[PDB]
Design an enzyme around this catalytic site. Sequence first.
Site, mmCIF file in Angstrom:
data_model
loop_
_atom_site.group_PDB
_atom_site.id
_atom_site.type_symbol
_atom_site.label_atom_id
_atom_site.label_comp_id
_atom_site.label_asym_id
_atom_site.label_seq_id
_atom_site.Cartn_x
_atom_site.Cartn_y
_atom_site.Cartn_z
ATOM 1 N N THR A 16 0.808 -1.211 0.000
ATOM 2 C CA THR A 16 0.000 0.000 0.000
ATOM 3 C C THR A 16 0.847 1.269 0.000
ATOM 4 O O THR A 16 0.299 2.374 0.106
ATOM 5 C CB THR A 16 -0.942 0.018 1.198
ATOM 6 O OG1 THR A 16 -0.158 -0.082 2.384
ATOM 7 C CG2 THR A 16 -1.910 -1.150 1.124
ATOM 8 N N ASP A 39 2.264 -10.329 -29.539
ATOM 9 C CA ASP A 39 3.391 -9.387 -29.554
ATOM 10 C C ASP A 39 4.417 -9.819 -30.606
ATOM 11 O O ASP A 39 4.015 -10.333 -31.658
ATOM 12 C CB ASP A 39 3.995 -9.302 -28.135
ATOM 13 C CG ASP A 39 4.627 -7.987 -27.837
ATOM 14 O OD1 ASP A 39 5.679 -7.690 -28.447
ATOM 15 O OD2 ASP A 39 4.088 -7.234 -26.968
ATOM 16 N N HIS A 69 10.820 -7.256 -27.422
ATOM 17 C CA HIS A 69 9.661 -6.682 -26.741
ATOM 18 C C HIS A 69 8.705 -7.755 -26.204
ATOM 19 O O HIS A 69 8.270 -7.696 -25.046
ATOM 20 C CB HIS A 69 8.965 -5.772 -27.749
ATOM 21 C CG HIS A 69 7.828 -4.961 -27.210
ATOM 22 N ND1 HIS A 69 6.510 -5.375 -27.309
ATOM 23 C CD2 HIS A 69 7.796 -3.720 -26.647
ATOM 24 C CE1 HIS A 69 5.720 -4.430 -26.807
ATOM 25 N NE2 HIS A 69 6.473 -3.403 -26.442
ATOM 26 N N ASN A 161 1.641 5.566 -25.508
ATOM 27 C CA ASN A 161 2.761 6.357 -24.979
ATOM 28 C C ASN A 161 2.860 7.749 -25.580
ATOM 29 O O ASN A 161 3.972 8.262 -25.760
ATOM 30 C CB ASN A 161 4.095 5.628 -25.181
ATOM 31 C CG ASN A 161 4.116 4.218 -24.609
ATOM 32 O OD1 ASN A 161 3.442 3.919 -23.629
ATOM 33 N ND2 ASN A 161 4.827 3.320 -25.278
ATOM 34 N N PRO A 175 -14.129 0.250 -24.926
ATOM 35 C CA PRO A 175 -14.468 0.325 -23.495
ATOM 36 C C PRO A 175 -14.511 -1.036 -22.809
ATOM 37 O O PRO A 175 -14.249 -1.109 -21.601
ATOM 38 C CB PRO A 175 -15.859 0.979 -23.471
ATOM 39 C CG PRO A 175 -16.194 1.311 -24.846
ATOM 40 C CD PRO A 175 -15.058 1.028 -25.772
ATOM 41 N N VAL A 177 -12.671 -3.724 -22.793
ATOM 42 C CA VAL A 177 -11.461 -4.407 -22.365
ATOM 43 C C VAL A 177 -10.853 -3.607 -21.216
ATOM 44 O O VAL A 177 -11.472 -2.661 -20.705
ATOM 45 C CB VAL A 177 -10.469 -4.584 -23.537
ATOM 46 C CG1 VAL A 177 -11.150 -5.400 -24.668
ATOM 47 C CG2 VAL A 177 -9.999 -3.248 -24.092
ATOM 48 N N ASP A 200 -8.788 2.178 -17.317
ATOM 49 C CA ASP A 200 -9.403 1.459 -16.206
ATOM 50 C C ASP A 200 -8.514 1.404 -14.977
ATOM 51 O O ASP A 200 -9.042 1.291 -13.857
ATOM 52 C CB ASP A 200 -9.716 0.006 -16.621
ATOM 53 C CG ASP A 200 -10.754 -0.072 -17.701
ATOM 54 O OD1 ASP A 200 -11.935 0.094 -17.358
ATOM 55 O OD2 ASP A 200 -10.436 -0.274 -18.890
ATOM 56 N N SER A 224 3.452 -0.529 -22.494
ATOM 57 C CA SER A 224 3.642 -1.939 -22.814
ATOM 58 C C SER A 224 4.126 -2.722 -21.618
ATOM 59 O O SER A 224 3.920 -3.943 -21.573
ATOM 60 C CB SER A 224 4.724 -2.117 -23.879
ATOM 61 O OG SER A 224 4.284 -1.667 -25.154
ATOM 62 N N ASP A 260 -3.489 7.404 -4.757
ATOM 63 C CA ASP A 260 -2.078 7.493 -4.388
ATOM 64 C C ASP A 260 -1.192 8.063 -5.492
ATOM 65 O O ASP A 260 -0.035 8.426 -5.217
ATOM 66 C CB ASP A 260 -1.578 6.108 -3.960
ATOM 67 C CG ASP A 260 -2.238 5.629 -2.658
ATOM 68 O OD1 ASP A 260 -2.520 6.475 -1.782
ATOM 69 O OD2 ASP A 260 -2.518 4.422 -2.523
HETATM 70 CA CA LIG Z 1 -12.619 -0.667 -19.899
#
Ligand SMILES: [Ca+2]
Length: 279
Positions: A16, A39, A69, A161, A175, A177, A200, A224, A260
Amino acid sequence: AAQTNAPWGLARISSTSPGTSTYYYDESAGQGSCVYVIDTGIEASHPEFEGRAQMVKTYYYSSRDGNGHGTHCAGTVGSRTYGVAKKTQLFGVKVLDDNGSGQYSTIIAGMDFVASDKNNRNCPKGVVASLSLGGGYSSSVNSAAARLQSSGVMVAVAAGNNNADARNYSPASEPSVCTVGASDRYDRRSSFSNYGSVLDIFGPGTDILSTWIGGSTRSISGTSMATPHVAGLAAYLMTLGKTTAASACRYIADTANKGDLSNIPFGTVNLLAYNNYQA
Ligand SMILES: [Ca+2]
């Protein structure tokens, strides 16, 4: 279980507060779950995967990861030293070439492939797909991600990015995923991370140590790198029985560390992935 002197991102998702160095996790460690890493491929022979990684499909001349990657992202999901879910099974789908590029038609085919292929695999605790890729908005790419999620796979995708609103990128902007932004080890939004109402969750994304090709390791940064922390966390929580593929993104958001992070624009969630482990 406790891994001492862990990479900072693993420690962060089991704490935390920032600044700790131990990763605390349940011994089950994602056993019985499966994660597809879509990927540049996976160097399945890397000792850190312990035989738990295999390539299942390529859209190019070879199934080898000639870039690095995909091997880095897979290591954050499930390698022994660098992974969130240290006993999961990893499946590689090579939709990006060895320069890291790929056409949208190929990326879509690879998503539809996973939705079918999972029906041939023994994954009793559930199935996750990790997509550390994207580009400009495409309704067809979004639709392919929505189909994969609908088929019963937890889909986690990178926010991108560009330090911009992720609504203009795909599959980030779909939306249904789980769209993942990046943070750094001081709990700031990573300076490159996209933001916006479609995100999310955030996970660690700056200076992330993981596996690399040639049996090596290296540290790199991006959304990524945040996405496989969340994909691995989902596999871990599904093995524990806390959530299902359909509801894992919501469960991760509900149980996140809240408020946070700094440098989060108004209208973007302030939620950092957290495993809630209590010994
Ligand atoms: Ca979502």
